[PDB]
């Protein structure tokens, strides 16, 4: 499992919990949606893009 479209619109907290169940060794970073980010691909990482309410605003994926 490397994408979590079912997390869009959920709280950042529930997203972290779900992703760590599926990928316990994940390196999670939370960033603001609508920012620009580096385009390295890190197989161990999941970037979570949140809106200003701290809900997930983009499908989380590995990278």
């Amino acid at each position: 499992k490397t994408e979590w479209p079912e997390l869009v619109g959920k709280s950042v907290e529930e997203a972290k919990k779900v992703i760590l169940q599926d990928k316990p060794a994940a390196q999670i970073i939370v960033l603001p949606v609508g920012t620009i980010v580096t385009m390295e691909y890190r197989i161990d990482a999941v970037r979570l893009f949140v809106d200003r309410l701290d809900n997930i605003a983009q499908v989380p994926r590995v990278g």
């Binding site: 960033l31 920012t35 620009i36 980010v37 580096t38 385009m39 691909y41 890190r42 990278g63």
Partner: protein
């Protein structure tokens, strides 16, 4: 002893080096997370930070900008790796913070700084799924001003028949670069779509990391500086070629790979690009 990462050989940069062309006097802005200027295998010529809480562009708290910079221009000497354009004038234009993220206005301010400082090439190993009129206006203005602008296509992989190229690579004025490995196979994470222009190596790319380190990274971020570096080699050999001509020379001389949706025009070949007559190999 210095090592030549496979990607530098793959795009045929050593052919330019043997002709005596290494990017000398070409100014390349790495618009990114900063560049560690203390690394002994880099020489940073200038730069500026647009990140309000990280004001030193010569401090790279992420590592990404320093890796990208080494692919562009790691020094030709007896240590570390060799950059595509090892004599390039490298500028650290820091618009991303430690966490690898930046606001659109930061990126735009860095593009503006590059134009105002007469950069010949911009590399943007960065992107997001949405554009803005003002981002588009900044990259269009840089191109109108004569700058070669190169960006990572994105690491969104495939999504059926939809384009997954991010911005600013998705803008027509910017060259969007996807990633292949050493066998010329598209990396599975590499974005796809009609906006994909060319490919370059972006799997297991060895380059400079902060604190005098080296390491292998993956991403369309690693592919883009092969192409920015190539543009600098071509300009050092043809200092009067316009950005228009440099872009067509790279497009028109790729080694064609698969369908253009997945591979664009194929793998860049800077040897063929820097000849006067261009054709695909």
């Amino acid at each position: 002893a210095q090592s030549v990462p496979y990607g530098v050989s793959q795009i045929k940069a050593p052919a330019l080096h043997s002709q005596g062309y290494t990017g000398s006097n070409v100014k390349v802005a790495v618009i990114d997370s900063g560049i560690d200027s203390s690394h002994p295998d880099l020489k940073v010529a200038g730069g500026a930070s647009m990140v309000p809480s990280e004001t030193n562009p010569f401090q790279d708290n992420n590592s990404h900008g320093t890796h990208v910079a080494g692919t562009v221009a790691a020094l030709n000497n007896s240590i570390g790796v060799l950059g595509v354009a090892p004599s390039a004038s490298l500028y650290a234009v820091k618009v991303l913070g430690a966490d690898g993220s930046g606001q659109y206005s930061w990126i735009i301010n860095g593009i503006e700084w590059a134009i105002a400082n007469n950069m010949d090439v911009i590399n943007m190993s960065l992107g997001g799924p949405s554009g803005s009129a003002a981002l588009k206006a900044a990259v269009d203005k840089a191109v109108a001003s004569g700058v070669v602008v190169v960006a990572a296509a994105g690491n969104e992989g495939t999504s059926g028949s939809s384009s997954t190229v991010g911005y600013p690579g998705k803008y027509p004025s910017v060259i969007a670069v996807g990633a292949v490995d050493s066998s010329n196979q598209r990396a599975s994470f590499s974005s796809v779509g009609p906006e994909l222009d060319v490919m370059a190596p972006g799997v297991s790319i060895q380059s400079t990391l902060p604190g005098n380190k080296y390491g292998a990274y993956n991403g369309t971020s690693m592919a883009s500086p092969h192409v920015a570096g190539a543009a600098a080699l071509i300009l050092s050999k043809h200092p009067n070629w316009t950005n228009t001509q440099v872009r067509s020379s790279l497009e028109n001389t790729t080694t064609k790979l698969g369908d253009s949706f997945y591979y664009g025009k194929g793998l860049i070949n800077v040897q063929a690009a820097a000849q006067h007559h261009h054709h695909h190999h």
